[PDB]
Each structure stands twice: as structure tokens, then as C-alpha cells.
């Protein structure tokens, strides 16, 4: 499918004399679920090492910007009522009480890291009230917030979305390699590095929603702009910088003015507040939600969020210094192959699925090539009988071809039959295409 003649080396009998193949390869990445093929040709009926690049999936990952944490909080109040001229019950001190200054009555609290505030309220003054003096008495209140539930939620926003391609690197003699990479980025794998161009689109705009993450539980979407300043009656009215601060109600957490409602009725004070439960909002908007045809959802492995939108990209990945050769592969192996069936469509991004029954005596590959060399089929061969499958592209309603198949041995013919279904576009001018297309919603 693609040779390395300008950098090919002698890959002596039996032993390997690879010379660290340095020539880079420029081949177009296959569509989603397709594969990219390489040719390492040595001596006929020998060598024929195949490097494959499976295209697992293409996702529109999120690039998070600012973030914070929040939880559920409830207040507790301590009250102390003193008559006039007792302690700091002077009226001038009474109205001018700073919220961050603690009264002397609540000194057993002492120094604490909890979020807290202090208020002073004037009351009646007179023998009916309980004090001989007729000037107004004072009531000192110290309130501190405490976390109700032992959980926290992280609220963030996606400034932009980035295309992200997942590849499965079927390396020479072993396919234990899976990598993930973005636009104009390279990953230092074995035998050198693999780079991705993806020159079509490196971004897919922005958004004006917010996202919630519950660790170990999933994600969710809330339909409000991400606000960096706390606001009463909204999400993130009390926000922190870490899960520990939320779970401990640390004083470093920020909050809006006037969240606590005070009821200084004459019998006992009532300290209470109405707070948006972040867990309720999190459960309301679990991730599989579609907004103006975007359908955000959890990325595979639940490490983030996606964005399924109509579109496509062009990906041209490049290898470099690809050198992975051994000596034991000098021995030859024979197989037996049997055509199984053919399904799928033509001229479609999904492509056509072929399947082949390989009856082989050992480890090996398959190198079926058509008469004109346009279409290539590669499938591993294993001991006994196995059923493998591959993805190809066609442009004919009916498929009837012959391929020259041989696993490092004698050349044999393989004949493929079957037809292909026609995809209804409901609107066609010239053709569909075969580029790399991202997942799209139905309403798009």
C-alpha cells in the first residue's frame, strides 16, 4: 500500500540486518473504523511485514478553562443576649459591628478555619424586656456554615473544542499499542514518533453553558453562563478551590453577600437560608442531553465530555524513523483462506465490510491484492481456522473481483462476490466522499 524504497534496508540469511529505517512516510489517515497500511517488502516469500494504523474514533473533546467546586451547606448560629452597658452593648458598637469580628461571649470558638460571620441586633430595653435600663439591649449572633453531604461537585466551562483522533498501532510482531493525539501534534511512540496534521479544522467554536462533574459518578450540563463571581439564587453561590475546602467549609471559600436569613424573634433566633442544591441540578441535567443540535456526552473512559456536531476533517498522519524488525521472521509460513461474505455500501464514509475465513498453521498475515493493485486486503493468520474482517471502499452497486492472496508463500487466487446497499442522501449532486467524518446528531 506504501513502500519505503528510498530508506529500505536489508531486513545474511536468517539474521536481521535492519539499518534503522529513517525515511518518513506521508499517507492519508483512514476514515473512522478504517485502517492505514504500510508495505515492508524484502525477499519474495519472506519478510512482508505490515504496520497498521487503525482509526478507532474521532471525538470533539473539551478544553476546560476556569473551574471551581461547590456543595451543600447549612448554617449554625450561637446567640448571646446582653442588657445595655454590658460588655460591648453600647449602641454605637451595636450598629457598627463588623461581620468579621468575633464577640467576647463566643471565645470558646476561638480561632477556627470555618466560614463564619457575626451580627449584632438591637432589641427592647426595659423591665418588660428583662433589663432595668431602658436603652436597647443587644443580641450577638455568630453563624458558621457546615457541609451536609460528604460530596462535592466541580463546575467548569469549555472555552473551545478540539478535534482528537484515537489510533491503534498494529506494530510489527505485536499490536499492543494504542495512542490518542490532537491537531498538529506528535507522540513519541516506539520506533520514532507519529504526528497528525488534521489540517481541516483545529477547533469547533465555543459555548455558553456550564458543566458539572461528580467524581466517580459522571458529568452533567447546566444551562447557565459560567460566572466567575458568586451570585445569590444561582449555582455556585458558595464556591471553593478544592474538594477538601467544600467538605470542610473552609474560610477560603467565596460566597455572595447576604445569604443567611436571620429571624431575631423574642423567644429564640432562627438562622436559616434557602440554597440551590447542586446535587439536584446535577441530577437534572445528566450528560446525554442535546442542545441546539450538539448532544454533549461522556467521553470514553469518562475522562471528559464530547460534542457531537455535523462536520468532517481531513487527517494526514506521518510516520518517522519507523524501525521495528527482528530476525526470527525470516522463516516462511503457509495459510489457507476462504471468502465468507460481503456487506455494506459504496462511496460511503462507513465503507464496505469484508470477512475472510483464514485456515493457517501458525502466525502470519495476508496480502491479497487485486489485478490493478488498487484494493488491498490485510488480515492476520493464526493456527487453526479463524474468522477475521476488514473494511474497504467501493464505488459499484455489485462487487465481483479476484485478488492475488499469498501469506509469505505461494500465490493463490481469491474470488469475492456480493452486492452493496445504496445510501439514500435525499439530495445528491455529484458524490458523497470518503474523508474522516465526525459523529453528528440526527437533527443536524
Amino acid at each position: 500500500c506504501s513502500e519505503l524504497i528510498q530508506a529500505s534496508s536489508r531486513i545474511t540469511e536468517g539474521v536481521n540486518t535492519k539499518c534503522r529505517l529513517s525515511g518518513t512516510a506521508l499517507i492519508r489517515a483512514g476514515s473512522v473504523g478504517a485502517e492505514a497500511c504500510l508495505m515492508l517488502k524484502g525477499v519474495k516469500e519472506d519478510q512482508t511485514k505490515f504496520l497498521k494504523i487503525k482509526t478507532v474514533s474521532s471525538e470533539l473533546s473539551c478544553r476546560e478553562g476556569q473551574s471551581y467546586w461547590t456543595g451543600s451547606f447549612s448554617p449554625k448560629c450561637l446567640s448571646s443576649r446582653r442588657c445595655h452597658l454590658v460588655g460591648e452593648c453600647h449602641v454605637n458598637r451595636c450598629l457598627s459591628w463588623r461581620d468579621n469580628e468575633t464577640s467576647a461571649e463566643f471565645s470558646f470558638v476561638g480561632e477556627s478555619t470555618t466560614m463564619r460571620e457575626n451580627k449584632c441586633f438591637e432589641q427592647c430595653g426595659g423591665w418588660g424586656c428583662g433589663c432595668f435600663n431602658v436603652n436597647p439591649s443587644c443580641l450577638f449572633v455568630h453563624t458558621y456554615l457546615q457541609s451536609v453531604r460528604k460530596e462535592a461537585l466541580r463546575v467548569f466551562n469549555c472555552i473551545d473544542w478540539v478535534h482528537k483522533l484515537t489510533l491503534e498501532i498494529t506494530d510489527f510482531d505485536g499490536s499492543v499499542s494504542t495512542i490518542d493525539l490532537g491537531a498538529s501534534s506528535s507522540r513519541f511512540t516506539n520506533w520514532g514518533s507519529v504526528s497528525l496534521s488534521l489540517d481541516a479544522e483545529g477547533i469547533s467554536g465555543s459555548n455558553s453553558f456550564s458543566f458539572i462533574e461528580s467524581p466517580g459518578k459522571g458529568y452533567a450540563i447546566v444551562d447557565e453562563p459560567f460566572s466567575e463571581i458568586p451570585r445569590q439564587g444561582f449555582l455556585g453561590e458558595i464556591r471553593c478551590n478544592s474538594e477538601s475546602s467544600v467538605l470542610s467549609a473552609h474560610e477560603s471559600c467565596l460566597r455572595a453577600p447576604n445569604l443567611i436569613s436571620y429571624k431575631p424573634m423574642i423567644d429564640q433566633l432562627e438562622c436559616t437560608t434557602n440554597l440551590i442544591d447542586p446535587f439536584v441540578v446535577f441530577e437534572r441535567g445528566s450528560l446525554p442531553q442535546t442542545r441546539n443540535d450538539k448532544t454533549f456526552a461522556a467521553s470514553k473512559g469518562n475522562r471528559g465530555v464530547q460534542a457531537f456536531s455535523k462536520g468532517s476533517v481531513q487527517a494526514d498522519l506521518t510516520l518517522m524513523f519507523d524501525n521495528f524488525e527482528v530476525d526470527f521472521v525470516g522463516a516462511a509460513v503457509s495459510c489457507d483462506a476462504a471468502f465468507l461474505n460481503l456487506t455494506g455500501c459504496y462511496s460511503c464514509n462507513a465503507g464496505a465490510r469484508v470477512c475472510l475465513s483464514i485456515t493457517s498453521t501458525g502466525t502470519g498475515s495476508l496480502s491479497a491484492h487485486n489485478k490493478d493493485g488498487s484494493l488491498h486486503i490485510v488480515l492476520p493468520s493464526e493456527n487453526g481456522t479463524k474468522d477475521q474482517c476488514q473494511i474497504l471502499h467501493f464505488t459499484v452497486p455489485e462487487v465481483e473481483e479476484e485478488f492475488m492472496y499469498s501469506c509469505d508463500g505461494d500465490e493463490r487466487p481469491l474470488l469475492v462476490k456480493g452486492t452493496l446497499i445504496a445510501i439514500d442522501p435525499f439530495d445528491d449532486r455529484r458524490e458523497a466522499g470518503g474523508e474522516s467524518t465526525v459523529v453528528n446528531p440526527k437533527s443536524g
Partner: protein, 412 residues
């Protein structure tokens, strides 16, 4: 001065230099030990000052955690003509004045030391001995390296130094290299495990986990305290060390009543009577584990050194040679056509005696361009510069053509 409540025996002295046994045998809050007080100076030995409640090198030696090397300290007075001063000469140290000895952890993982002849002192680089008249040498030995040790049973016989791009670090010859060798002095962290040698590390990823073993508790007592050791009138308020082996374990037997904080009461049995000592939990102690090769292990000692490392900058920065000629250039009456075998051509330009002509097209194995000036009529040599999709292909080629006939070009 809680840091002077040493774990274990706390014997901060070296063999031979036993003239300070009053205060260097078990180090306590009272005295002053020359081989220990240097560790607590601000700005010096920060790694140990962080892990201040772990054993030192001498403490580890006296607890049989770390062995003593062959010729434990070959005296320069009697063995200055022997190949002793070899691992020390590759380190860059700095000793203060009036010190007659200095100990370090050698390559094998044991403790060695350098001792000057009597009345001599180690110079500022700890490499030479010099004599000063009327000078009072300190009775201890200067710790050369910044390290802390602990007791471990984890095996490390398969552990070895794995440093990338390093031909030789310290006294260890990692490999054999030829060519350029960037030689310098660098600060390399190192660890020592059980049944192994020194292991230099590229990165220091270590974590500590707490426990309730006796080494994790600091037990003290007051001087002049009622019904305790040293029960006599005192003129000063000073503390005294206590041995935790006396306080009974929970659901067990013991010889002394013993009280403490929450952790001690959870681990040991706190008394309900008048207590004989107070046992707090260690500020920082525990078990330290080092990440080597991606897996955590329990090291005997952890420290860092300033040793001479030889690196290889590069074998070859980059090789750019591309005499590629895998294309055919032929001048045609319709236009100047070049067919590039393999690599596709998107845009190209043609030069012919100053005048140039450009062309743009989709990436394809061939491209056609208008002739530059009168080169079509005059023939000659025309240069071509094209942009290929691949690499390692020459972008400058030359095409020789004879004079052409425009009659076929404009024929209609």
C-alpha cells in the same frame, strides 16, 4: 528542641572518635554533639531538616541498618599511599573548619570516612589535611552528604541505576561511549536499598505513610519530676528523654505508667494514675517509599550528592541529505509538464534567466506550468522549485530543453 529526641539508640558518634561520649552517646536535649549539631543549622542539610525525625547515617550504622565498609576509615596518617581517596575525590563537598574527620555513604551502600592525622584538620573542600597551631579540633565527624536513613526489609537486589544519556555518574560506569562527553558536576539524588548498591535516580518521587510503631513516638520526662528518674531539686526547667519500651502496650504488661496524646492512647495503654512520662506522636515520622521504575519501594537510605557526571550531548543532531530525482520533466507545446513519481506536487515555480512563472494545483503526481519568458523559444536550462507532500526530496531541479516551435502551440 524536640529534634534532639533521637529515634532508636541515637548514637551520633563514630568509632575512634570516642572523646565526646558524654553528649554524643544518646543525643538528648542537654548537651552538644559536633557530629549532630551541624545538621540543625539553618540553610544547611535541608533534606534531613525536613525528615528530621529519621535516623542519620551514624545512627543507622549503630542500629546495624547500614554496614561499615572494608577499611572503615583508612587513616591518611597510615594509608595515604593506598587507593582509598577515590569515591570522595569525585564529590564536591564543603567542610567547615576544625574538623578532623568526615563520614559519607560509599558506592557499595556502606559507610566510609576520611580521618586526618592527629592535630590536622580537613580543608574547605575536605580533600586535604592542614595543620593550624593552637587550634581545638572538634571531637566529631562532619556528615558529608545530605541524606536520611530508615529500617527496611524490602529487597532490592535487582535495583540498578537507570539514567538516560549518562555515560558515567559518580564512580559508576553506566556504559561505554565514544566521542563528545559533556563532563560536569551535578546534584544527583540517590537511594540505597537492601542487598544492593547506590542507585542514582533521575527523579525523586517519594511519599510517607504514618504508623504506630515505637519509632513514631517521642517520649519525654521532666528533670526534677516527682516519682521519676532524676528526682532531685533543679535550678532550671529542662526535659529528659524517655524509653518507650517501658510503657505497656494496649492489653499488655509494662514497667512504667505512661500517658500521651490521642495517637499514643490509641496505640498504647494510657494510665489513669499519676504518669511517669509524656509520649507525643512524631511530628513527621513514618515509612518513606521511593518510586523507582514506576513502582514504589522501601529504601534503606535516601539522599543527594554533588558528583561528576559525563553525558553525551548527541551522536548526530540531524541529517539532511536528499539527492532525489524521482521525477521526469518534459517541455510540451501545451505547457511545461513535470510528472513526479510518488510524491504529489501542489504548487511550483519555474526560473529562467530572471523571469519566473508560478503554478498552483491540487496535490498530484504531475503539474503543468506556463513557459517563463522566451525560454520556450530559446530552449536552454530552466530551474524548477516545487513543494512536495513528503520529505527527503530535493526541491530544486533543472530541465534542459531545445528550442520549441510556437506554431503547434497556437495552431488552431
Amino acid at each position: 528542641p524536640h529534634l534532639r529526641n533521637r529515634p532508636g539508640k541515637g548514637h551520633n558518634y563514630i568509632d575512634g572518635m570516642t572523646q565526646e561520649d558524654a553528649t554524643c552517646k544518646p543525643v538528648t536535649y542537654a548537651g552538644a554533639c559536633s557530629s549532630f549539631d551541624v545538621l540543625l543549622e539553618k540553610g544547611k542539610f535541608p533534606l534531613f531538616q525536613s525528615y528530621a525525625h529519621h535516623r542519620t547515617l551514624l545512627e543507622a550504622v549503630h542500629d546495624t541498618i547500614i554496614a561499615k565498609a572494608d577499611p572503615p576509615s583508612c587513616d591518611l596518617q597510615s594509608a595515604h599511599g593506598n587507593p582509598c581517596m577515590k569515591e570522595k575525590l569525585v564529590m564536591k563537598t564543603h567542610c567547615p573548619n576544625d574538623y578532623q574527620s568526615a563520614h559519607y555513604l560509599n558506592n557499595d551502600g556502606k559507610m566510609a570516612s576520611v580521618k586526618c592525622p592527629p592535630k590536622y584538620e580537613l580543608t574547605e573542600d575536605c580533600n586535604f589535611c592542614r595543620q593550624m597551631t593552637g587550634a581545638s579540633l572538634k571531637k566529631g565527624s562532619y556528615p558529608l552528604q545530605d541524606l536520611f536513613c530508615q529500617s527496611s526489609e524490602d529487597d532490592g537486589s535487582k535495583l540498578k541505576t537507570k539514567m538516560k544519556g549518562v555515560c558515567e555518574v559518580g564512580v559508576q560506569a553506566l556504559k561505554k561511549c565514544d566521542g563528545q562527553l559533556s563532563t560536569a558536576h551535578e546534584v544527583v539524588p540517590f537511594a540505597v536499598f537492601k542487598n544492593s548498591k547506590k542507585v542514582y535516580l533521575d527523579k525523586l518521587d517519594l511519599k510517607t505513610e504514618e504508623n504506630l510503631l515505637p519509632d513514631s513516638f517521642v517520649c519525654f520526662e521532666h528533670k526534677g519530676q516527682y516519682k521519676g528518674t532524676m528526682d532531685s531539686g533543679q535550678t532550671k526547667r529542662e526535659l529528659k528523654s524517655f524509653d518507650i519500651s517501658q510503657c505497656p502496650k494496649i492489653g499488655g504488661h509494662g514497667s512504667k505508667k505512661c500517658t500521651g496524646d490521642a495517637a499514643f492512647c490509641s496505640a498504647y495503654e494510657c494510665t489513669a494514675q499519676y504518669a511517669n512520662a509524656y509520649c507525643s506522636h512524631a511530628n513527621g515520622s513514618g515509612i518513606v517509599q521511593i518510586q523507582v521504575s514506576g513502582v514504589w519501594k522501601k529504601p534503606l537510605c535516601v539522599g543527594y550528592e554533588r558528583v561528576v557526571v559525563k553525558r553525551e550531548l548527541s551522536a548526530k543532531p540531524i541529517q539532511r541529505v536528499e539527492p532525489c530525482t524521482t521525477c521526469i520533466t518534459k517541455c510540451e507545446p501545451h505547457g511545461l509538464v513535470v510528472r513526479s513519481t510518488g510524491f504529489k506536487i501542489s504548487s511550483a515555480v519555474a526560473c529562467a534567466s530572471g523571469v519566473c512563472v508560478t503554478g498552483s494545483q491540487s496535490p498530484s503526481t504531475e503539474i503543468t506550468l506556463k513557459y517563463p519568458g522566451i525560454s520556450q523559444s530559446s530552449g536552454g536550462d530552466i530551474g524548477v522549485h516545487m513543494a512536495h507532500d513528503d520529505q527527503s526530496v530535493s526541491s530544486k531541479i533543472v530541465a534542459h530543453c531545445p528550442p520549441q516551435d510556437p506554431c503547434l502551440v497556437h495552431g488552431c
